[model samples]
Target: MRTYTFDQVEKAIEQLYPDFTINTIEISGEGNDCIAYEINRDFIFKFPKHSRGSTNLFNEVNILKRIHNKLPLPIPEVVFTGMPSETYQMSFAGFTKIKGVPLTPLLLNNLPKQSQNQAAKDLARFLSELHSINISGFKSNLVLDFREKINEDNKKIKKLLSRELKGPQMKAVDDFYRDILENEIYFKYYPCLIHNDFSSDHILFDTEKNTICGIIDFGDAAISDPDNDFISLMEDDEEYGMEFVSKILNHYKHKDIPTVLEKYRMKEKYWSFEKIIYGKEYGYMDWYEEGLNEIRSA
Candidate 1:
C-alpha cells in the first residue's frame, strides 16, 4: 500500500485549494483500503490506497449524492471532491463532519436502558428510510448467482482454512456453509440501498442527548439484501450486539426475522474466513492470521 505523508497531503491541498486556510490536519481514519485526514476538525478528507480506491471513492460520492439529507439522521455531506494530483494519483473527497462520537457498545452500555431502547427505535427509523432510498443505477460488485458464488468460495475457504480448522472446527464451518447453501429461502430478498458496513463505528451518537445523531463512511455502501444492513448488529458485544439489533428489528419494517436472522448468523459465522482469500491477494498478513484464528475459535 502507498503511504501519504502529511507534507504530501499538504502539498496536494495547496495545489488543489491554493487560497484555502489550513490550521491543522490530523490523521483520522487509516484502514487498508483508504486514508482519512480530518481538516480543521470540520471536514474529513478521504483518499484511496488500494487498487479499487478510485472506483470505490467515486461510488461513495454517487451514493451520497443520491441519498444525502433524505434520511432522518445526519450524514456527512460532500464538501468537494479532489481530483487526481501529482502526489496522489487517485481521486479523493472531503465531507462536512456530522456532530457526535462513534456509537460504541461501551457507550451504549453506559446509557440508561430507556435511552438504549430509544436509540434502537431511532436507528430503526433511519434504516427503514435508508433501505427504501431510490436505487436507480446502484449496482453491487456481486455475481448474478450469489449462492453459486458462495458455494465456489466455500471450496476455496475449506482448502485454505483446513490448516487452521481440523476436527469439529472444520465440521462446524462446513455445517454453517451447508445451511447457507441449502437455504434458498434465505437468499430470496429484493436488493435495496444498504449501509453494507453499518457497524457501530459508522453510527454517530450524541452522548448528552442520548440519541443517534449521524452516520459516516459510505465507502462500502451497496445495493444488496436488506438483511445486509442488519448482519453487523449480530456482532457479539455483552451489552449491545443482538440485544440492540432485536430492539431495532421491532421497529424495522424492511426485514423478515427468520430469513434475515439465518443470513445474518451465516454471514456472522463465515465472512471473516474470506479474509484468507483477501490475505493472499492483498498480502495482509493480519487478515490471513485473524481469519485462521476465527476458524480455530469457531
Candidate 2:
C-alpha cells in the first residue's frame, strides 16, 4: 500500500498507461481515507489517500484475490494495481467497469414481487457460495472481532464527545456504547470470510435476469463470524428477519444455528444500530439525517 499525492497520481498513470491519455478524472464517491474515481473507458479506481500514513485498502485487495475464484457470483475484475508512485501521491487499483444496473432500494421497490423474490434467491445462492470457500484458504494477518475493533472506535468517539458532547444523538450513541460493553461476550466467537459491509450499495443488480450482476466494494472483508453478513439483512428489513435468515441458512445448508456463532451474530447486529447512527452523526450528513428520520418515525 502506497501513499500518493494528487500530482503523483497523474505521474503514476502516465508511467503505467502512457499510451492512453487520461485527459479527465472525476471524483465519484466519498470516504475519509480513500476516494474513488471514474477514469476514461468506464474504468473505476479506488484511490487511497495515505491518511496518517496507514494504508488499509491493501487488506481489501488481498481478500478479493483470496475469494475471487471461490465466489459464487461474478466480481469486479481488477484491471490494474498501482503502487504509491513517486509521481503520484496515492495508490490505486483499477477495475473493469461492470456494464449493469445497480439494485438500489428504490430500484428494488419498483420491481415486481417475482423479480424481487428471484433477487433474494440469487443473493442466497451467492452468499452460500461465498460461505463455502475453505476456511484454510485464508491466511489472516489481523485478528478480527467486531466488538474489539469498535471498542477502539468508541474511544475515538469519546474524545470527540468530550470536546462538544451534549446532544440527543450523542446520548443515543453513548447508550449504544454501554449496551455493547454490557454484552461484549456476544462478540466472542468463530471467524469466517464475512463481507463485513454487505449492503445494497455493495451489490449490483440485474433487473432483466433477476439476479445479482456482481458483488463489488469489498472494503470491509474480514475473517469474522458469518453472522456479520446477516446483520445487513436484519437492518434492511426487521419484519423479515426469520425469513431472511432461513433463506440464506438453508441455501448454505446449515441445518442448525451454530450456537456460538449466533452470539457474535447478535453482537454484529448490535454494532449495526450504533454504526447507522454514527454514520449519520460523524460519518456522513445525508446518512445521519436519514437515521434521525428513522428514529423519529420509530
Candidate 3:
C-alpha cells in the first residue's frame, strides 16, 4: 500500500476545494482498503488505497445519494468528490463529519442492560427504515444470491484447506461445510439494499447520551440478501449480541429464523475460518494465529 504524506493530501484537497481552508488535518482511520482524514473539524476526506477501492468509492457515493434522505440516522452527505491529480492518482471523496465515535464492543458490553436494549431497538428501527426503501433501478457489484455466494465461498475454502489443514481439523471443517450445503435451501431470500459492512466500526455512538448518532462507511453497501445485515451482531459480546439480534429480528418485517441461522453459520463459522486461511496465505500472522486459536478452542 502507498503511504500518503501530509503535503500530498493537502495538495489534493487544494485541487478539489481551493476555496476551503484547512486549519487542521488529522488521520482519523485507515484499513486495508482506504484512509480517512478528518479535515477542519466538520468534514472528512476519504481516499482509496487501490483500484478496487476506487470502484467502491464511486459505488458508495451513488448509493448514498439515492438513499441518505430516506433513513433516520445520520449517514454520509458527500460534499465533494476529488479526481485523479498529481498528489494521488486515484479518486477520493469527502463528507460532512458525523459527530460520534465508532461504537465498540467494549462500550456496548459496559452499558446497563436497559441502555443496551435501547441501542438495539434504535439499530433495529434504523434497519427497518433502511430495508423498506425501494431500489428498483439501483446498480451495484455486490453478490445477490445466497446459493452463488455459498458456492464461491466453498470453492475458496476447499482450496485453502487442502493447502493448510489436515486430519481432525480438516474433518471438522468438511463437516461444517456439508452441514451448510444441506441447509442451503433455508438461506433463500429476496434481495434489497443492505449495508453489507454493518458492524460496530461503521456504527457511531454518542457515549454521553448512550445512543447511536451516526452510521458511516457505505463502501460495501449493496443490493443483497437482507439477512446479511444481521450477521455482524454476532461479533459483539455474547449475551449482548444475542439480545441485539433478538431485537432486530423481532422488529424487522421480513424475519426468518432459518435464514438468520444459516447466515450465522456463514458469518460466525465459515467466514471466520476463511478469514484465518486468508490471513495465513497473505502474511497477516496475527489474524492467522487468532483464527487457529478460535477454532481450536471451539
Candidate 4:
C-alpha cells in the first residue's frame, strides 16, 4: 500500500478545489485501499491508495451521479474525479460532509435492539432502491454476464475458505458451497444490479432521523444476483440477517430468495484470514493476531 502524507493530499486538493484553504485533515473509518479525510468543515475527501482497479474509483463517481437523488436522502456530490496526475497516482472524489456519528460505534454494544433493527432496515431499504436501479447508465457497452460472475465470486469464496477454514467452520463452508451449487440453477435466473459490497462499515447512518445518510465505498458494484447485498448483511448474525433479507425482499417483491448467508459468512471468514496474511506481510503482527481471533470466532 502507498503511504499517503498530508502534503501530497493537500497538493491535489489545491489543484482540484482551488477556493477552499484546507485547514485540517482527519482520517476516519477503516479500509486497506482508501483514505477518507474530513477537510475543513465543508467536505469529506476520499482518495484511493492501492485499489483493486482504477475502474472502482471511477465507478464511485459515475454510480453516485446515477443514483444520488433517487434515494430518500442526500448522496455524494462529486467535486472532481479522475487521475489528477501521476504524483497522486490514485483516483478520488469529494462530497459535502453529512452529519452523524459513525455507525461503527453504535453497533459496538447491545445498548438497544431498536437501533440495530433500524440500522438493518435502513440498509435493506438502501440496497432495495440501489439494486433496483437499471445499470444501463453505467457504461456504453457494459452488458454484464451475471451467470459467470456469480460462479466467479463463488469460486473466490471457495478458494478463500479452502485455505483457512477448520473443524465445524470448515465443514459449514463446504455445506454452504453444496447448497449454492444445488440451487445455482435457480438463482442465476433472477439477475439484477448488486452493490457487490454493502457491509455496515461502508454505510453511514443518521441516528436522530433513523435513515442512511451516506454510502462511502463503491469499488465493487456490478450486475449480479440481488442476493449479494442480502448475503453481505446476513453474514453478521442469523436472526438480524433474516430480518434484513425479509425487509429488503418485502419491498422489492421477490419470493423465496435463496439463502446465501453461509456464503457471505465464509467470505468474511476468509477475509479475516486474508487480513491476517496482509498484516503479517506488512509486519503488523498485532493486526494479524487480531484477525486470527476474529476469524476463529467467525
Candidate 5:
C-alpha cells in the first residue's frame, strides 16, 4: 500500500472538486483508520490511511446520506465521494465542516456543572433518537455481530497486555470478561443502529453553548448491541464518566440500560487497558498514561 501525504490529498482534492479555490490545507485530525484535512477552512477532506479503512469511507457516506435528517443533532453532510485514482488508490470523501471541537474529558470537566448535566442529557437524547431509527431498510457492507466483535477485541487486548499486566490486573481483567460473557443474555436485545465508536473523539461540543453540537465520523456505525455504545462510559475520571452515563441512562430509560451499564462498568478496566495499548501503538503517551492511571486507581 502507498503512504498518503498532504500533497497527494491536496492534489486529489483539486482533481475531485476543481470548483473550489484552495488557499491552505492542514491536518485536522487522524484516527486509527483515516486522516482528515481541513480544506480552505470550509470543508473536511478525509482519506483512508490503510486499505481496510476504504470500506469505512463508503459506509460513512452511506450512513450520512441515509440518517442525517432523523438525527436531532448536526451530522456531516457529504458533499463529494471521490473514486480511487492513480494518485491515491483508496476512495475519499469530503463534507461541509461541522462546527465545534471534539469533546474531551478535560474540556468537559472544566464546564459548569449545569452545563455538563445539560450536555449529558443532550447526548442521551441524541442516542435515544439515533437508536430508535429502524435500520432494517439500510443496507451496507459493514454489518457486525456485537458479541463476537467485542469478544475478539478482548482477545486482542489480552494478547497486547499479556506481558505488562500484573497478577491482580490480569485476574481483574479475566473476571470482567467472564462476567460479560457468562451472562450474555443481558446483552441480548433487538439490534439497534449504534455509533460503535461513541467516544470523546467523535462527540462534538460547542464550548460557547456548553452543549453537544454534533456527532461526527460514522465510520464505525452499525447495527449491533446497544451496550457496545456504552463501552466508552469509562472515557473519563470514573466518577464523572459514570455520572454522565447515569444521566444518559435515566434519560434513555431502556429497561436493559442499567444492566448493560453495570456490565460495561465492570469491564472499564479492560477498556482502559485497551486504550493504553492503543495509545502506545499509536504514539499518544498522554492517552496511554490516562488509561494507565485508570487501571492503577482501580
Candidate 6:
C-alpha cells in the first residue's frame, strides 16, 4: 500500500538536468491519480499513481502540445519528459509553470465588481477561442457523444453504488441520468477541443493585475461537448454564477443563442455526476464519495 514514491522523481530530475539545483520541491497529491511536484516554482512535473494515470498523462501532454499556441491566455508547455524505468514503471512529463493562483468561487466573490466583470470576459474569450479550434482529428481518439458518455458512466456509478445505496438515493442517480439521456439536443455539437475540467482550480488569476492570467490541467481535455467547459461558471454561488456567466455568454460566440442555455443547464445538472465517474476512473474513492454525497443530499 505504498504511495508512488518521489525518490525516483528526484533522480529523474537530476538526470534530466544535472546542473539544476533543488531548492524547494512541493508535492501536490490533490488529484485522484497523478502526484504533481512543483519544482522551484518554475516547472510542474506530473507522475502517475497507477496504470490509468499513465494513460491520462498522454492525454494531458498531447492536448497541451496541440493547443499550445492557440489559446487567448497562456497554457503550460512540456519542458521535460522521462522514460519509464524499473522503479518508475510509468513515464512522466514536466510542464513550464503558469504562474498565478487558482480562481476559486470564494476568491472571485472577494474581487471588485470591476475585476469580476473583466474575469468573465477574459474567460469567455478563452473558451470561445478554444472550442472554435477544429478537433476533427480527435474524433476517433476522444468522446464525440455527450449522451453516450452519460449512459456509460451512469452504469459505472450504479455498480459502485451497489456497494452502498438505498431507494430514493438510487432514484436520485437515475433521475439525473434520465434527464440528460432524454435530451437528444445535447448530443449534437460541432466537435471542438474543450478543457473538460474547466473548474475553479484550473482557472488561474493574477493578484496584482486582478484578472485571470492563464489556465492549467488538460488530463480531461477532449472533443466533447463545448458546453461541458462552462459547467464551473454555472455552478458558482448562484447570484454570482448566473450574473458572471451571463456576462460571459454575451461575449461567447459559439453555439446557437437559444441552445446555449440548454447546454449550460444540462452541464450544471450533470457536472458532479461526471465528477464521480472521473473519480472512480482515477482511483480516488474519496472524490467519488464526495460527489456521491452531493447527489444524496440534493
Per lDDT, the best of the predicted structures is: 1
Put down candidate 6 lDDT per residue, 1-298, tens digits, no spaces: 1265567778877887798787878885456668899888798989877666666776778788878898899999987776665544346788999889988888998999888888988999999999889766674556656666677888888887777778777887778778777777887666678888787888889999998998998987878777767655576453237667777877785446467677777666566777688777766688788887877776
Model 5 clash count equals 0
Q: Least accurate stretch of 10 residues (summed lDDT) in model 3?
A: 234-243
lDDT for each residue of candidate 4 in 176-287, tens digit (9 for 90 to 100): 4466557545345456666677666666776666555777666577666677677666544422345555655666565555545544554555566556656755567787
TM-score against truth, every candidate: 0.85, 0.71, 0.83, 0.69, 0.77, 0.81
Q: Alpha-carbon error at 129 in model 1, in Å?
A: 0.4
Model 1, residue 122: distance off in Å is: 0.8
- Can you write out model 3's per-residue Cα lDDT over 157-200, one digit (the tens) per residue? 67765766767777887777678778745465667888988888
Residue-level lDDT tens digits of model 5 in 97-193: 9999978877888899888888888888988898888877865455676567568867876776676678887777677667667776645677888
For candidate 2, the clash count comes to 8
Least accurate 10 contiguous residues by lDDT in model 2: 234-243
Identify the superior model by TM-score, candidate 2 or candidate 6: 6
> Evaluated with TM-score, which candidate comes out highest?
1
For residues 1-298, write the lDDT of model 2, one tens digit per residue.
2344556666767777777567667765656566777787477777775532124566666667666667767787776777654544336777766766767766766778777677777777777667656777566453376667668767765664444445675777687777767864557655667777777777787766777788877766767776657656544443234455556566556654565355535554444445454664455666545544543332
| Candidate 5 lDDT trough over 10 residues, lowest sum | 231-240
Model 4 clash pairs are none
lDDT of 1 by residue, 1-298 (tens): 7678888877777777888887999999887678999899898888788657766776777778878779998998987687754544346788898889988889988889899888999989988999877777655552134676687888888888767666777898788788777877756778678888788888999987879999888887877777877777677763257767888888986446777777776776666877887886678898888878777776
What lDDT does each candidate get? 0.78, 0.64, 0.77, 0.62, 0.77, 0.77
Off by over 4 Å in 3: 84-90, 109-114, 166-178, 207-209, 236-240, 280-283, 289-298
What lDDT, from 0 to 1, does candidate 5 have?
A: 0.77
TM-score of 5: 0.77
Candidate 5 lDDT for residue 17: 77
Cα shift from native, residue 100, model 3 (Å): 1.7
TM-score of 1: 0.85
Which runs in model 5 stand beyond 4 Å of their true positions?
84-90, 150-182, 238-240, 266-298
